[PDB]
Design a protein around this ligand. Structure first.
Ligand code: ZN
Ligand code: ZN
Length: 51
C-alpha cells in the first residue's frame, strides 16, 4: 500500500517518535537527532508525536 512517511530534511533519515515541523519553511521536518544537534534553530518549529 501507499504510505506517507516523514523524512528528515537534515539527515534524510526517518522521522519517528517526535517530529519537529517548521512553522515557516514549507514541508520541512527534523528528527529528534537533527533537532538535538540544533539544526534549523532560527525558525519556530512544531513538536508533536510522529506515529
Ligand atoms: Zn535527522
Ligand atoms: Zn524554517
Amino acid at each position: 500500500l501507499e504510505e506517507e512517511d516523514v523524512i528528515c530534511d537534515g539527515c534524510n533519515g526517518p522521522v519517528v517518535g517526535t517530529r519537529y515541523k517548521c512553522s515557516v519553511c514549507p514541508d520541512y521536518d527534523l528528527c529528534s537527532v537533527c533537532e538535538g544537534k540544533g539544526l534549523h534553530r532560527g525558525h519556530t518549529k512544531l513538536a508533536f508525536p510522529s506515529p
